[PDB]
C-alpha cells in the first residue's frame, strides 16, 4: 500500500525530469550536463506548473508530506546519472524553481501547519557562520548488528540495549563515523518579517529556519529575500530522560529550499508633453508640502534618478549613486525637518541618527560557548540596499562612525572581520544626509579653516552642498506658515487624488532595463561647455567652499 505509492511518486518524478518540449533527443541532456558539471554550479529547474497539470495530486501530496518526501528525494532521486562510478563521490544534489506563480500569505502561514510549503520572504537578520556539530550517523558494529534506516537523525543516541558489549556507554569514546554521515553544509538565518507589510505597531516575529549550502554566499545581510518485536520486550524498563525533549520541541521546525494599467500611467507622460513649461510644473509636483527652499529640493529631486553601470569587462566599479549633504540650521528648529517629507516613500531607512545602541554594523562574536546577544550583521545601513537611505543626525559621527562611513562610502562594501567571521557585502544605495554646525553659523565672516570643525575626508567625498539664506521677502515669509496651517482647513476644501506621487516614480525604475541608446552627439556638447565651467569658477564670485 505504502510501497506502491512511494514507488509511483518517484517514478512520476523521474520520468518528468526530461521535458518533451524544447525539441527532442539527447542533445539537451548533454547541454545540461555541460552546464552543470563543468562549472559545478549545480543549478537545475523544472516547471512546477506543468508537473501540476500532469498530476495535481502530486502537488497536494508533496504539500502535505514534505517531511515524508525529503528523505526519498534525497536518496532515490540520485539515479539520474546511470553511472556507478559517479554515485559514491556525489554527496548531495541541487535543484530549484523560478517565477513560481503560486504562493501563500505569511499571515495565512500559521505555525499550526508544519509540513506544508512556505515562501522565503522577509528581511535577512542574524547571519551565522557554519558550525559542524554532530547531526546524524551511527557507530553500530557490522559484526554485531546490521544497519537499519532508522537511527539518530537528531542529536539523540541509540535507544536499544541489545548485545551489551559496546552498548555500555559509561566511558568516553570518540569513534566518529566520518565515512557514513550527513555532513555537507548548513547554517541558520533568523528571517525578520517585512517591515513595510508590518503596521505601525509591529512586534516582529523572528523566524527560525535552517538554510543549507544553497544559502552559502547567496544571501545578503539586511536585504529582502528575492530569489515487530519478539521475546515480550514490553515497557517498564528504566532509562527515560526528558533532557532531549525540551530543547528542540519548543522551537519552529520546518524546512525550506530556494497591461492597459501600465499604459495608463505612461500615457500621462506622453500626453502632457504638449503643455508648455512641463518641466517646471514637474519639479513642484513632487513637493506639495514645502514652502521656500526651492534650491534645497532641487538637489533632492534629482537625487531620485539613478543608473549604476554593471561590470562586464572586469574593470572598476563605475559609481552611479548621488551623495549630497545639506548645510542648514544652526541646530535649533532644524531645517532637516524636510527630511521627514522623504520618509513617505518605499525603500528608505528611518535612521535614528547615530547616538543609539546600534547593534548592527558592529558585528560581534556569537559563540560565547552557549550563545551571544551581538550577531554578525551590518543592517544598520545595508537595510536600504537597492533603495535610498536617509541618515539623520549626520554630525554625530565623531569617533565610531567616522572610520565606519568612510569605508562604506568609498568601497560600497563592508569588510567585517572578527577572527571567526570575514566576508564582504554589497551596499548599493544613495546617502541623503544633512549637517549642522556645532553651535551656530559663524563662517560667514571667519574662514572655513578649523572653524567648521568637522571631518574633511568624508565631507570631501560628498558630491554637493547647500546653503539656506533667508531673505526679507514678506510675500513668502508671511505665506510660510499659511501653507502649513492650510491642511487644517479641510472642511471647505477636499483635494482629489488624480495619481499617486509615488507610483509614477516607480515607473521610471523599470525603464532602466530598457536601453536609451543615447548618441555621443548630445553627450559631448556638455563636455565641451564643461571646459568653460572649470575656468569660470575662478571669476571672483562670492566664495563658499573651494572644491574643484
Amino acid at each position: 500500500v505504502r510501497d506502491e505509492v512511494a514507488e509511483k511518486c518517484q517514478k512520476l518524478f523521474l520520468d518528468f525530469l526530461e521535458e518533451f518540449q524544447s525539441s527532442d533527443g539527447e542533445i539537451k541532456y548533454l547541454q545540461l550536463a555541460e552546464e552543470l558539471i563543468r562549472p559545478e554550479r549545480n543549478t537545475l529547474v523544472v516547471s512546477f506548473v506543468d508537473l501540476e497539470q500532469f498530476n495535481q495530486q502530486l502537488s497536494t501530496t508533496i504539500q502535505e508530506e514534505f517531511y515524508r518526501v525529503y528523505p526519498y528525494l534525497c536518496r532515490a532521486l540520485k539515479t539520474f546519472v546511470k553511472d556507478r562510478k559517479e554515485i559514491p563521490l556525489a554527496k548531495d544534489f541541487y535543484v530549484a524553481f523560478q517565477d513560481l506563480p503560486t504562493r501563500h500569505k505569511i499571515r495565512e502561514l500559521t505555525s499550526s501547519r508544519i509540513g506544508l510549503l512556505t515562501r522565503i520572504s522577509g528581511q535577512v537578520v542574524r547571519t551565522h557562520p557554519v558550525h559542524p556539530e554532530l547531526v546524524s550517523g551511527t557507530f553500530l558494529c557490522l559484526d554485531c548488528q546490521t544497519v537499519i534506516r532508522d537511527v539518530e537523525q537528531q542529536f539523540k543516541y541509540t535507544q536499544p540495549n541489545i548485545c551489551r558489549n559496546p552498548v555500555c556507554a559509561n566511558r568516553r569514546r570518540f569513534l566518529l563515523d566520518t565515512n557514513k554521515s550527513r555532513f555537507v553544509d548548513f547554517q541558520k538565518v533568523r528571517i525578520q518579517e517585512t517591515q513595510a507589510e508590518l503596521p505601525r505597531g509591529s512586534i516582529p516575529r523572528s523566524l527560525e529556519v535552517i538554510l543549507r549550502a544553497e544559502a552559502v554566499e547567496s544571501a545578503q545581510a539586511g536585504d529582502k529575500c528575492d530569489f515487530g518485536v519478539d521475546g515480550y520486550e514490553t515497557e517498564g524498563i528504566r532509562g527515560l530522560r526528558a533532557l532531549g525533549v525540551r530543547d528542540l520541541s519548543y522551537r519552529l521546525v520546518f524546512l525550506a529550499c530556494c497591461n492597459q494599467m501600465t499604459v495608463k500611467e505612461w500615457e500621462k507622460v506622453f500626453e502632457m508633453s504638449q503643455d508648455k513649461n512641463l518641466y517646471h510644473n514637474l519639479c513642484t509636483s513632487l513637493f506639495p508640502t514645502i514652502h521656500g527652499n526651492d534650491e534645497v529640493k532641487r538637489g533632492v529631486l534629482l537625487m531620485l534618478f539613478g543608473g549604476v553601470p554593471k561590470t562586464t569587462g572586469e574593470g572598476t566599479s563605475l559609481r552611479g549613486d548621488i551623495n549630497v549633504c545639506i548645510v542648514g540650521d544652526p541646530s535649533t528648529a532644524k531645517s532637516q525637518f524636510l527630511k521627514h517629507v522623504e520618509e513617505f516613500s518605499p525603500r528608505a531607512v528611518y535612521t535614528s541618527g547615530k547616538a543609539s545602541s546600534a547593534a548592527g554594523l558592529t558585528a560581534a562574536v556569537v559563540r560565547d560557548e552557549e550563545s551571544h546577544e551581538f550577531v554578525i550583521e551590518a543592517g544598520a545601513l545595508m537595510l536600504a540596499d537597492n533603495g535610498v537611505c536617509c541618515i539623520d543626525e549626520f554630525d554625530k559621527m565623531d569617533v565610531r562612525d567616522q572610520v565606519a562611513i568612510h569605508e562604506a562610502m568609498e568601497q560600497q562594501t563592508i569588510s567585517i572581520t572578527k577572527a571567526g567571521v570575514k566576508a564582504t557585502l554589497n551596499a548599493r544605495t544613495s546617502i541623503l544626509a544633512a549637517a549642522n554646525p556645532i553651535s551656530g553659523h559663524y563662517d560667514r565672516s571667519k574662514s572655513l579653516k578649523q572653524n567648521i570643525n568637522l571631518s574633511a575626508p568624508i565631507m570631501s567625498r560628498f558630491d554637493l552642498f547647500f546653503i539656506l539664506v533667508d531673505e526679507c521677502n514678506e510675500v513668502t515669509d508671511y505665506a510660510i506658515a499659511r501653507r502649513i496651517v492650510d491642511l487644517h482647513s479641510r472642511i471647505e476644501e477636499s483635494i482629489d487624488r488624480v495619481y499617486s506621487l509615488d507610483d509614477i516614480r516607480r515607473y521610471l525604475l523599470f525603464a532602466r532595463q530598457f536601453k536609451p541608446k543615447i548618441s555621443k552627439e548630445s553627450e559631448d556638447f556638455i563636455v565641451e561647455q564643461y571646459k568653460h565651467l572649470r575656468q569660470r569658477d575662478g571669476s571672483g564670485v562670492t566664495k563658499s567652499s573651494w572644491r574643484i
Binding site: 517531511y67 505555525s111 505597531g201 516575529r205 515487530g228 543609539s356 545602541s357 506658515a481 499659511r482
Partner: protein, 529 residues
C-alpha cells in the same frame, strides 16, 4: 447514543424555539455577519437571558467545559442539514463575549474551581509560540492498523508514552492527527483600582491551549474572560511525588450624564470662570502657579512642591509610569531581553518608555543622567516614536504620547518647553503655607468621566482669523524696548488646541486670545539676561 448523567439538552429551548421564530421577529448586524461573510468563530455577546431567567444562565457557567461544546455542536449541526454546500472543514466555536464581571476580582476565591471569570489588567510579557501535541493516538503491533475510537473528547495524552518508538514524530505527526497546537505564555497584572496600597497585586498566568493566540493584540487593556484551571506540579521530575499545591491559570476564551455637560457651558460665559477653575482644580498645589500652565491646560531646591507635583499626575491619571535615573542604566529602562537559565526559554523583554504611549511619563532629575542614555528619548522627542534596535528586533515602537517636565550652548532647543524657577525673595508668600495646608490637612466619580467620555468626540478646528495672529505678533514687538526667528513659535499651535479643548468649544471667542500672547512674555523673561 447519549448519557443522561449531566442532563443537558440542545439549548434547553428546542420546543420554545419554534414560537421564538414566529414571535420575536414580529441589531441586524449580528444576524447578517453569519450568512453573508461566512466568518468562523461565532462571537455571541453577553448572556442576556440572565436578565430574563437566572436558571438558564446558572447552568452555563457551572460546567462551562461541558457547555461550550454543546453550543458548538448544536449550531454546526443545524447548518449542516440546512446548508449542505457550506464549509464543514472549518469548525466554528461559539465564544462568550464580555461575560459577567466576577465580583471582587481581588478576592478570587478558590471555591469557583471551574467557572468563567473576567480579569482586568495589562500584559507584561509574551512568550514565543510554544507548540504542543493534541489528539494523540497510540501505535499497535497488529499490522499497525489504527481504528477511530477516540473521536469522543475526554482523553488525556499523558507524557512519557513516547520514550519508545520515537518514529511517532515523523510517522504519526500527520496520519494520527498529532499536528502541533499553539499556546502563548502571558502574564497579566491585576489593576486594583487605586487601592490604598495594602496587599501585593496578584499575577495571573494566561497560557491556555486555544489557537486564538495573537489574534488579540498583547500590550493593551485586558478584558479577557477566562476559565480557571488547576494542574498538579511535580515535586521532582525524577520521581512521581506531587505536592498539595496547585498553580492557578486562566483559560484563553475571548475575541442624565449629558445633562451635566450642558450646565458647564452656561456658567462658562461668566467672566469669573478663570478664578473658579484654578482655585478648585488641584488645590493641593502651592505657589509658582506658572508651572500649572503645563499641567492644567494639558490635562484638562528640588522637590519644593515639584516632585509632589509629579505625584499628582500619578495619582490623577493611573495611565503612566513613574521612574528616575541614577538607579537604572540605559538597558535598565527598556530592551532588557533575557532568557531563563533554569528553564531554558527566551523572553522578549520590553520597557516602560515603550509602554508609555497615550500618557505622560514622570521622569525627573534629567540633568543627572549619563550621556550614554538619553539616546532613546532623543528620537522620541525628535521623531515622536521609539525605535528599539536589538539583535532580535529591529523596528520602531509607536510613541504617540507627550511627556513634559521642568529644568533649573543653545542646543537645549531639543526640549519642548523650558522653564526656570525664580526666587521672588518674598517671605510673605511662604506665610500662606501654614494656613493653606497645615490648618486644612461620591464626588470622585464625576472627575473621572470628564476625560474619557467628553473628550472622545471633541476635535478642534482652527479658523482662518486665528492663525496669522501669532505670526504678526512677534515681528513688530520684538524691536520695541531693545530667539523668535526659528519656526519654534509655529509649533505653539499644538498647545493652542488646549484653549479650544476647554468648554468643549470648537469655536474661538474673546477668551483664550490674549492668553496665548502673554505666553511669549513668560518664555521671554526666563530666556532673558
Amino acid at each position: 447514543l447519549v448519557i443522561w448523567g449531566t442532563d443537558v439538552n440542545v439549548a434547553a429551548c428546542k420546543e420554545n424555539f419554534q414560537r421564538f421564530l414566529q414571535r420575536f421577529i414580529d441589531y441586524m448586524q449580528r444576524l447578517g455577519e453569519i450568512n453573508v461573510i461566512g466568518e468562523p468563530f461565532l462571537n455571541v455577546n453577553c448572556e442576556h437571558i440572565k436578565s430574563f431567567d437566572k436558571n438558564l444562565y446558572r447552568q452555563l457557567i457551572s460546567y462551562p467545559q461541558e457547555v461550550i461544546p454543546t453550543f458548538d455542536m448544536a449550531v454546526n449541526e443545524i447548518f449542516f442539514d440546512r446548508y449542505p454546500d457550506s464549509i464543514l472543514e472549518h469548525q466554528i466555536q461559539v465564544r462568550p463575549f464580555n461575560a459577567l464581571k466576577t465580583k471582587n476580582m481581588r478576592n478570587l476565591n478558590p471555591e469557583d474551581i471551574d467557572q468563567l471569570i473576567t480579569i482586568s489588567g495589562m500584559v507584561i510579557r509574551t512568550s514565543q509560540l510554544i507548540p504542543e501535541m493534541q489528539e494523540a493516538f497510540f501505535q499497535c503491533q497488529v499490522c499497525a492498523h489504527t481504528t477511530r475510537v477516540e473521536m469522543d473528547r475526554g482523553r488525556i495524552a499523558e507524557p512519557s508514552v513516547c520514550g519508545r518508538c520515537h518514529t511517532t514524530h515523523s510517522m504519526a505527526l500527520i496520519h494520527n492527527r498529532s499536528l502541533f497546537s499553539d499556546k502563548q505564555m502571558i502574564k497579566l497584572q491585576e489593576s486594583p483600582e487605586d487601592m490604598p496600597a495594602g496587599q501585593t497585586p496578584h499575577t495571573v498566568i494566561l497560557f491556555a491551549h486555544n489557537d486564538l493566540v495573537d489574534k488579540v493584540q498583547p500590550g493593551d487593556r485586558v478584558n479577557v474572560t477566562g476559565i480557571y484551571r488547576a494542574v498538579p506540579i511535580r515535586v521532582n521530575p525524577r520521581v512521581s511525588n506531587v505536592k498539595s499545591v496547585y498553580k492557578t491559570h486562566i483559560d484563553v476564551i475571548h475575541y442624565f450624564s449629558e445633562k451635566r455637560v450642558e450646565l458647564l457651558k452656561e456658567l462658562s460665559r461668566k467672566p469669573d470662570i478663570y478664578e473658579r477653575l484654578a482655585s478648585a482644580l488641584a488645590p493641593s498645589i502651592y505657589e509658582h502657579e506658572d508651572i500649572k500652565k503645563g499641567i492644567l491646560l494639558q490635562l484638562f531646591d528640588p522637590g519644593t512642591s515639584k516632585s509632589q507635583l509629579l505625584q499628582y499626575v500619578y495619582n490623577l491619571v493611573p495611565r503612566g509610569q513613574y521612574t528616575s535615573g541614577k538607579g537604572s542604566s540605559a538597558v535598565g529602562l527598556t530592551a532588557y531581553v533575557m532568557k531563563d537559565p533554569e528553564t531554558r526559554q527566551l523572553v522578549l523583554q520590553t520597557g516602560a518608555l515603550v509602554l508609555s504611549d497615550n500618557g505622560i511619563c514622570c521622569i525627573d532629575e534629567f540633568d543627572k543622567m549619563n550621556e550614554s542614555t538619553r539616546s532613546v528619548l532623543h528620537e522620541v522627542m525628535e521623531q515622536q516614536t521609539l525605535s528599539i534596535a536589538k539583535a532580535g528586533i529591529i523596528c520602531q515602537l509607536n510613541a504617540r504620547t507627550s511627556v513634559l517636565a521642568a529644568a533649573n550652548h543653545t542646543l537645549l532647543s531639543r526640549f519642548d518647553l523650558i522653564f526656570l524657577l525664580l526666587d521672588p525673595q518674598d517671605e510673605a508668600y511662604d506665610r500662606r503655607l501654614a494656613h493653606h495646608l497645615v490648618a486644612l490637612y461620591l464626588d470622585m466619580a464625576v472627575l473621572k468621566d470628564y476625560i474619557a467620555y467628553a473628550h472622545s468626540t471633541i476635535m478642534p478646528r482652527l479658523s482662518e482669523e486665528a492663525s496669522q495672529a501669532l505670526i504678526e505678533a512677534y515681528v513688530d514687538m520684538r524691536k520695541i524696548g531693545s530667539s523668535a526667528y526659528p519656526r519654534q513659535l509655529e509649533s505653539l499651535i499644538r498647545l493652542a488646541e488646549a484653549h479650544a479643548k476647554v468648554r468643549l468649544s470648537n469655536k474661538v471667542e474673546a477668551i483664550d486670545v490674549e492668553e496665548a500672547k502673554r505666553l511669549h512674555r513668560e518664555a521671554l523673561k526666563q530666556s532673558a539676561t
